[PDB]
């Protein structure tokens, strides 16, 4: 009918409103853990950055990007894709590590002469040292990344708990350390091959942080999207409700006419 077809579509809209509401609340819960990890991680990262900066942080190229297996992370997947897309015009033949399925789909579209490594099982898990270490271990051998001048990693810097800004930063090669000369304002002889150790160490130390920053933005986006959805569904609820009410009146009238006619005869 009108009455029933309105109502079933309206019911669909109601159920969707509810699911997106529910998801949004659960998202706030998840967001807290993500952010908490990110604080401690970021504190650690800054200390590493002190070395690279004070050393002079003077460094194809590599691109690493991160967006979870999980979707309904708002437009993280495609906003990060957009800031990537710009730099796939700056290097259409960049060697891509895609951390999680959602970014993988978008980047795969942007240039499929790039994709060499991708990492599954990312999204579900919150950032963890084990993962960072394993990704790092495969990365050096497989991608020869340090060989390519400049490494850059893309992540989403979690600007506010209502926003996400896609961001990139440069991971530093063994080269960065090598020809930066205020590396000499740190002292080691040859008793440690500090480039060969530290590069490997900072591959993870930066990456884990990047993932933490990303994860907080990801969950923040999920919350944002799911909130706005509840609103959009609400608007549609109201529109079909008014129609329902009018339709109800019409049914009453049509029945009433039948009765009137009957009484008349």
């Amino acid at each position: 009918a009108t009455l029933k077809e309105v109502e079933m579509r309206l019911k669909s809209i109601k159920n969707i409103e509810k699911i997106t509401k529910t998801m949004k609340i659960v998202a706030s819960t998840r967001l807290s853990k993500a952010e908490k990890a990110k604080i401690s991680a970021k504190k650690m990262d800054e200390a590493e950055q002190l070395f690279y900066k004070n050393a002079e942080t003077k460094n194809k190229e590599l691109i690493v990007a991160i967006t979870s297996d999980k979707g309904l992370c708002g437009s993280i997947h495609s906003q990060l894709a957009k800031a990537v897309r710009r730099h796939l015009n700056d290097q259409p033949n960049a060697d891509i590590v895609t951390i999680g399925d959602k970014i993988k789909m978008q980047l795969l579209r942007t240039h499929p002469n790039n994709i060499k490594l991708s990492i599954n099982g990312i999204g579900k898990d919150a950032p963890t040292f084990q993962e960072s270490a394993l990704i790092a271990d495969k990365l050096l051998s497989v991608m020869k990344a340090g060989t390519y001048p400049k490494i850059s990693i893309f992540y989403n810097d979690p600007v506010s708990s209502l926003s996400f800004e896609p961001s990139e930063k440069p991971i530093f090669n063994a080269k960065t350390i090598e020809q930066s000369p205020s590396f000499g304002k740190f002292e080691i002889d040859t008793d440690a091959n500090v480039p060969r150790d530290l590069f490997e160490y900072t591959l993870a130390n930066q990456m884990l942080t990047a993932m933490a920053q990303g994860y907080a933005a990801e969950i923040s986006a999920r919350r944002n999207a799911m909130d706005n959805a509840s609103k959009n569904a609400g608007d549609m609820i109201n529109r079909y409700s008014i129609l329902y009410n009018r339709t109800r009146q019409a049914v009453i009238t049509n029945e009433l006419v039948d009765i009137i006619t009957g009484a008349s005869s």
């Binding site: 991680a41 200390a47 002190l50 070395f51 740190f186």
Partner: protein, 120 residues
């Protein structure tokens, strides 16, 4: 001062004296120290903030006096429960299994960890 950090936590990130197990042997840092990079090895670490000293089991990291005399120590996870015999039993079995079974790095770790554990 000392900044001793973890990804998920922070341990000290005005620590007076730190005794550190380094790829430079063992290094001790007090206040202004010579401006160094030494890789922090898998370690049993003593950190003293004042004279009070606390002893840590750490799954290694990096140690760095900055040229602004800030000892950035970064490590990635681990106590004294960890020392407690149960680890030794498990590790003895696991070390043996690894002996029979990249394998070089693994086996080196089983032994290294056995040493690292003994250090606690």
């Amino acid at each position: 001062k000392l900044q001793f950090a973890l990804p998920h936590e922070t341990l000290y990130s005005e620590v007076t004296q730190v005794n550190l197990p380094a790829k430079s042997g063992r290094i001790g840092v007090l206040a202004n120290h010579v401006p160094t990079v030494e890789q922090l090895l898998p370690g049993v670490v003593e950190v003293m903030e004042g004279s009070n000293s606390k002893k840590f089991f750490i799954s290694g990291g990096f140690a760095t006096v900055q040229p602004d005399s800030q000892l950035c120590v970064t490590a990635i996870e681990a106590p004294l429960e960890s020392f407690s015999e149960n680890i030794k039993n498990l590790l003895a079995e696991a070390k043996k299994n690894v002996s029979s079974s990249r394998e070089a790095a693994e086996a080196a770790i089983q032994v290294e960890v056995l040493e690292n554990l003994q250090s606690v």
